[PDB]
Ligand binder design. Sequence first.
Ligand code: HEC
Ligand code: HEM
Ligand code: HEM
Ligand code: HEM
Ligand code: HEM
Ligand code: SMA
Ligand code: SMA
Ligand code: FES
Ligand code: FES
Ligand code: SR
Ligand code: SR
Ligand code: SR
Lengths: 179, 179, 256, 256, 428, 428
Amino acid sequence: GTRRDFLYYATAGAGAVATGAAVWPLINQMNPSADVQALASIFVDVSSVEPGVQLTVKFLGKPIFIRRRTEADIELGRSVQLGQLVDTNARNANIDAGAEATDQNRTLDEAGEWLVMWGVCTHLGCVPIGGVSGDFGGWFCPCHGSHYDSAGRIRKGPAPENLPIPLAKFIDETTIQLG
Amino acid sequence: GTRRDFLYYATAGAGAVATGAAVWPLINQMNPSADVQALASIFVDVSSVEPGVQLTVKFLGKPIFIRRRTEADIELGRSVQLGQLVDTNARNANIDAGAEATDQNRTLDEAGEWLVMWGVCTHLGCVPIGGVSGDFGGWFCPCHGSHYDSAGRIRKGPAPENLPIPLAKFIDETTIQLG
Amino acid sequence: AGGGHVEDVPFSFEGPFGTFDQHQLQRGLQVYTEVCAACHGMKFVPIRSLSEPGGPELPEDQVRAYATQFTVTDEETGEDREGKPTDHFPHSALENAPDLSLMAKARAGFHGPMGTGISQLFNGIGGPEYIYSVLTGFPEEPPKCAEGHEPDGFYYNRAFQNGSVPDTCKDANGVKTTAGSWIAMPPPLMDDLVEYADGHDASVHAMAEDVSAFLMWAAEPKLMARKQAGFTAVMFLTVLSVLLYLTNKRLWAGVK
Amino acid sequence: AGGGHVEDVPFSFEGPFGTFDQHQLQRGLQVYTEVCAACHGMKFVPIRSLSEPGGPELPEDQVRAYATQFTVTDEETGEDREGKPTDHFPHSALENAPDLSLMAKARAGFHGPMGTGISQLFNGIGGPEYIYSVLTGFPEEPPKCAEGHEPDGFYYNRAFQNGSVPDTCKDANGVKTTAGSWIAMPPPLMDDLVEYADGHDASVHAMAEDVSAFLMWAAEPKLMARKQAGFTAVMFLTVLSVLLYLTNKRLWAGVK
Amino acid sequence: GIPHDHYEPRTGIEKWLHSRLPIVALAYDTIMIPTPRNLNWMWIWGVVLAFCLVLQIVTGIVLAMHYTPHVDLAFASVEHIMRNVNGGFMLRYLHANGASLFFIAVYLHIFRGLYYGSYKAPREVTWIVGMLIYLAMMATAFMGYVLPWGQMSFWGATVITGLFGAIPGIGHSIQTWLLGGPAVDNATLNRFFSLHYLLPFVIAALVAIHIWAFHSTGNNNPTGVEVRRTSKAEAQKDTVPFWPYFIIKDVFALAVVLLVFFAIVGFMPNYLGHPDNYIEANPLSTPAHIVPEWYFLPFYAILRAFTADVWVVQIANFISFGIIDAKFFGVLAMFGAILVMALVPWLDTSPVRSGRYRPMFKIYFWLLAADFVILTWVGAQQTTFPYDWISLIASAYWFAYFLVILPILGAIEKPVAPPATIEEDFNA
Amino acid sequence: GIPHDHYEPRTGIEKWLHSRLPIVALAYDTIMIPTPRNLNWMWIWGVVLAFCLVLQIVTGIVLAMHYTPHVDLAFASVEHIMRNVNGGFMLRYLHANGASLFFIAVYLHIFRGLYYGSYKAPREVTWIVGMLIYLAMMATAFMGYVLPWGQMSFWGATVITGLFGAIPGIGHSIQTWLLGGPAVDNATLNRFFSLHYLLPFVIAALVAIHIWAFHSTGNNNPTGVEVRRTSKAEAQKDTVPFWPYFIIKDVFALAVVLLVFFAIVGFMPNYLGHPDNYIEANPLSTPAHIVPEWYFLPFYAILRAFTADVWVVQIANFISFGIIDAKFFGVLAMFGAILVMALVPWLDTSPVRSGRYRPMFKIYFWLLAADFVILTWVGAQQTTFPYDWISLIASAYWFAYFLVILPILGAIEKPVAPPATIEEDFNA
Ligand code: HEC
Ligand code: HEM
Ligand code: HEM
Ligand code: HEM
Ligand code: HEM
Ligand SMILES: C/C=C(C)/C=C/C=C/[C@H](OC)[C@@H](C)[C@@H](OC)[C@@H](C)CCc1oc2c(O)c(OC)cc(OC)c2c(=O)c1C
Ligand SMILES: C/C=C(C)/C=C/C=C/[C@H](OC)[C@@H](C)[C@@H](OC)[C@@H](C)CCc1oc2c(O)c(OC)cc(OC)c2c(=O)c1C
Ligand code: FES
Ligand code: FES
Ligand SMILES: [Sr+2]
Ligand SMILES: [Sr+2]
Ligand SMILES: [Sr+2]
């Protein structure tokens, strides 16, 4: 009848719920525990950095590059036209999401001297090698051969995007606040 | 024949050796590694010990008891006859192995004031509770109910032996060297 | 040593539907910081957990301000700095003062009868009740049996059972006569030693009950989450058991 | 960066029957202590292993005396004390000086040909050969392509391949022309910088070869035990393979 | 070897797979085995044990993803689980209380077998595999309890490693080998972790053999009368297929067990625990109120009952020239109590399988059940009078049951006639 | 399902045991299966894999007794093994080099199957179970290499969890779930330790089905002609019993493999390793000469071959509206390379099983074997010209072989007649 079949549905429906209630916590325990910080904030002293020096700093378990760019680095970055870039988005947390990847939109200052970005290859997360490496006067990722230029923009290789720029701002003349 | 069975012997004999050579290191890796100290040497300051106080010190991962015995403790220890003891051996590394468990042979000094011994129950290794505990004015082991007297000798329970006394001697007026 | 009698306090968190009083935990937190923290640490409690739901639930800015007072040795730097919410409470400043992170669970106040465990089954383990009794059990005069035989540096406490006792306080069989024994903790509380912000009375009774609730939360911060899950599982399985009972019956019907 | 040429030293420990030279390892230890230790640590080497068989095998009293020179922070006390044999060698004093515990295994001196690994198959990985080349590969004059373009605080080394190189030392594709590159380590050695007790010569050649052998031991202290086991296992299995071959043959005879 | 119908592929996918890998045929023949119709509620504890093994394994693997086997970090990593891992507090209490449920089930499972003669021929192999599982369970649960590195963890490890030190001659070598040093330390914690992970997989392998064992012979039932095998016609009057009839019955009973179990975990998760294991391991101080895990108490009570004063110990020590002192005697007594229970198929000389039809046997069995509860209770009391006597008398009866009563009973008892068939019992 | 004789208990213990648990009967029917007489030396790699699984497990449990899954202690604890644990250095080199031996054997094992058509009907299940095993091996070996927490450990873990970030939409969630945070840290190491322990037991369970699978169908042989099953007379002309004939051959072959294997471990244990994993993990610096484990190189070469400049990639990006960029394309190419090999029973449309009698097939097969070696070699080179093209040409041929050549060959090729029976080939 109609009252007979209702038991076999209600029982099976309850059984289905019980499996789901047990499986979700077995998955969610692998999600970040309460001791894990998603975002944080720190301050970096930069007065000792001459042009041509890259400072590498740990932030959320990953490297952040703070390079005081030379004259050559700045000139090369500005000479690249937007249409010659793999990724034309600035990837800059400090400005609008739709901003273009011009060298001006890749630095913290108007002079374009301070390049602050995640030293995390956008391919699969290795640390690109700086010191003017690669074929575009920037960084070379030794893991699968991505080349970034002097503004940290991806130019060659498997990596899909420019190295991201975190929230970063000078709190005073000589100190950058990340986050 | 004679050589036909010999091949089957050399093969079976080799297999036995091969198993033995493989099984022994799987057992021996569990024996103490090189970072483990078997015996070591240390010094204990005792000037702060009043009569009736037990000092408990860590040595080779186990507790060592240093009790400055009171008048009552010493008299009780000397009043016990050998035939009333479960274990009549002194268990004292500092004197002959066959020495008897008289109260004199259980202390470092002739006056019998300084009782130094391993605070390791001779039953199954728990730490007996001191402060004149148990039924014999000494120590009580809460793990299976062993009672030790004022000289640390086993009197009642499953424990087979008196608490062992390590190599111990006064290096000067106020310092005991264990080991 | 042994077990003893504890005062049966009615804490809000007791019973299957029991829950923490948020303001009480904050008062208890104030007591810990102003009194207990001088000697006792909570090395397993992250300071940030004061914000988590089901506890004191302080705004994250207050917790950030609270963490500053602690001097933490930074792991990477190795140099000292102000505390953050991500730091744990410090270790015990006093070497023989036990850590209080898990005290409310590492002590049982209810035992027996005749070692059948029935007492704990109905009254709970009784850890926060025990803490309350120790904070309450400091009398101004010691028991008459030790009039002038107190060990120096120790104090008689009614509820403490693991302490030493003078020879004059034992019977002919060596068992102690006193309800409690001598503890190395001097009486930490005293009327209005703490000035509660909400004007809650700060008698030894209130502070002892308040800090016991805080110490219950520090030991079992997920208590409320644990019970919600219990209710859900029991209601699920009650329904499921009924459905499975009728199902089992209607199946075996075609046999008997 | 890339791989490069290393000087093929004939170390005693190479080959299946190769073994450490006891006197050489001791000389290398003196070089490490008197020269390298100023900057480099060996944080994974227990000092007591200087007594263990298969190494320098110094008497345990000498090692005990040797350990005193180090100032170690005791784990429980937290205060400084003299070193014991049970302590490890200190960490690198100079922050950018790599730890040398495993250097002789963390560097390969032989590469190729054309990335086929055939070079390593016959000459070994070549770590101590690499170390020897770095200690040796400091020329008094730099290469002509960088006469006055040297980075400040760096030094040209023939064998170091992971260093930076001036722009005037790169070809049209930016690949470096020089055999080596610029290393942050100043030349640590110099003729008779160390006074060996037995009067052994202490030229840069001798110290570089002696300390490379010591650093090979620090990385693979159980090298000799491993080969004995290799020899033994091979001799067992040689006999066993022959016997199993004959067994397999006489069995399948009754089929074909 | 009971007559039954076999699997037959119907869908095209089934015909395809069955001619390559008969895995469906194996699952079908397993889940449709004709099982005696008259099984009562004491036959459910096998599934409860089955659930427990999976619960412990799945929560265990998960817990090991957040736990650190190092003495400096072990205790802290469990508090990290309790406080920080999502649902970590619940997974731990499930794993810990899951061990108690695991042990409640074997004791009911075991005593079921002792009453209904499920160990008697042809089921000796089923019984012995069970005994091997039981030893593995104890070793696994012991080592798990060590991992938090609390006070009970550390001193339980000290004591239990000390058991092996009581063996004459070789005792200290085994003890040093188990410890990896002069004392319980990191080497001990590190190796106990590896073995705590391994053994549950051995148990799983043993359970597979266990199931294979009682599938070959067929399940026992309350009457002890075997299913008729002369034809398929009369096997069905004694049986119903395992699926659906007993699957649904198992799932129902399981839902009720979990109702109680989840109420415990949700509302009183620490009742069956020792508060002192929330205190960090202290190698210089043993807690005064140290007590074993409740499921170990009966064997603990037996061991410590044999003190120096006990006269059979004094005879043993004298006759053995001192080799068997109270210490070693107590160890022999404890493992011997488990061994005589393993030997009950060869000690029970009665040809009547089910104890339901053995009037004298019922008396001595229920005394044994009471004795097991008594032994559990005295384990938690002091060793003073009268508990010292209660534990000696209780130990004596345990050995008397297996070594004296059961052999004697099989040559004296006058049993009642069981039913002719299972069908007769079911209709009644 | 070949005709053969069955077990019969002889000893009283066997008659006793067989009527309760036919476990000896199960061992008999397994070890006495009639196996084709004409198996060559390419049929040994199953036992080598079997030995490896036991070796890794026995050395693994032992290593887990001394290893600490904590970022601050992991690397040091492995050096503790090398320097302090009795025989620890040898146990470490055996576990590490044993993984290489494990992978040498599968690749030889796999290509054996690809040549002789051991994947074709009725052996699809054996092949698919094999493919599941192969994935489990890779996941196990990956997580094991992370445990020492060297430079290769840390950055390999960063990259391989990064593979999962390439899935559109859900990629970032999966990566965080695998990592347990924003980056490779302690939570990641800790869970990899638990899973590195678990999966070898899952492989063992899969191997059990694997053995059951080819026991149900019977072993393939070099001729591809199945054993005659019409009578026991003609089944015996095609076969010999597995024991003793192939046991001794396996033990013999195994001893020769171990002779070489122990020479590597004894005299060049680091040849197959990367020196950079003797450097502590540095989350701020990736080595310039970072290279995967050799047994991962072919699949690594395929992934990085697909850059933004690749023509087929630019079409994919355009047609897919940007979803499939070079990053995700390379991941699809890498897992796709394994999948098309899993699908080879349904892509090889030829009815001739063994490639020995397929003239055109032999050419493209040996190109695949050569191609697989090329991919391994190019994996270790730089990404500059010409290696960038070599990896593109090699990747292209890998997919062309399975997706184009094999389907086309089965409808064009003129195969040679195989022997009438297995007996004919053996006698020749
Ligand atoms: C400070 C004055 C040093 C002394 C004395 C020694 N070393 Fe050193 N070393 C030092 C630094 C700062 C570095 C880093 C090099 C860099 O460019 O970053 C090194 C490096 C090494 C290496 C590693 C080479 C490499 O491939 O990275 C080796 C093998 C090495 N040094 C060897 C070595 C030895 C044997 C020394 C004693 C004879 C020694 N160095 C002394 C700083 C200093
Ligand atoms: C038959 C199976 C098992 C039994 C009987 C068992 C038993 C136990 C017990 C009693 C504890 C102590 C819990 C406590 O007091 O907090 C424990 C702890 C632990 N077990 Fe198990 N366990 C089993 C399976 C497993 C498996 C398979 C694993 C890991 C893969 C595991 C991992 C752990 C861990 C990590 C701990 C310490 C963390 C904790 O205390 O919760 N367990 N186990
Ligand atoms: C993890 C542990 C165990 C599991 C999963 C398990 C599982 C089972 C199951 C499912 C059954 C059938 C259902 C039932 O009879 O309740 C069974 C029966 C049985 N088990 Fe166990 N068991 C375990 C431990 C043991 C132990 C420790 C013993 C004995 C010391 C034992 C002895 C028996 C016996 C005698 C039977 C009766 C089977 C028959 O009647 O033929 N088992 N077991
Ligand atoms: C630890 C992993 C493995 C073990 C222990 C194992 C074991 C075996 C054994 C003993 C055989 C019998 C023939 C021989 O020895 O050559 C066999 C055959 C086979 N294996 Fe594996 N194998 C493993 C992995 C794999 C993998 C990864 C694949 C495929 C991707 C695979 C596919 C096959 C096939 C197709 C056969 C032929 C079966 C037949 O002769 O009918 N195996 N395996
Ligand atoms: C059965 C297949 C297995 C494979 C293919 C495998 C593979 C590996 C590999 C390649 C490593 C890296 C070795 C190194 O470079 O240091 C490793 C590490 C390790 N594995 Fe396994 N493993 C297996 C089984 C196991 C099991 C079952 C366990 C533990 C019970 C285990 C425990 C370890 C440990 C402790 C390490 C780190 C220490 C070391 O090996 O150097 N392995 N594994
Ligand atoms: C590498 C692994 C090893 C060495 C495993 C060995 C396993 C041996 C046995 O299992 C088969 C063993 C667990 C089992 O003996 C039959 C138990 C019933 C032993 C019962 C037992 O427990 C105690 C315990 O838990 C404690 O906790 C705080 C403290 C204890 O003293 C006060 C004990 C104790 O005095 C006894 C007798
Ligand atoms: C909890 C468990 C998890 C997350 C399991 C995930 C398993 C994923 C896959 O297994 C099925 C994976 C192992 C397998 O992909 C088919 C390999 C062939 C991937 C090969 C691989 O290796 C690398 C490697 O080893 C490195 O070492 C230092 C470094 C690497 O960058 C430079 C790589 C790398 O770029 C690739 C593509
Ligand atoms: S990780 Fe940077 S290129 Fe692949
Ligand atoms: S350990 Fe002290 S009596 Fe059992
Ligand atoms: Sr109450
Ligand atoms: Sr050489
Ligand atoms: Sr182009």
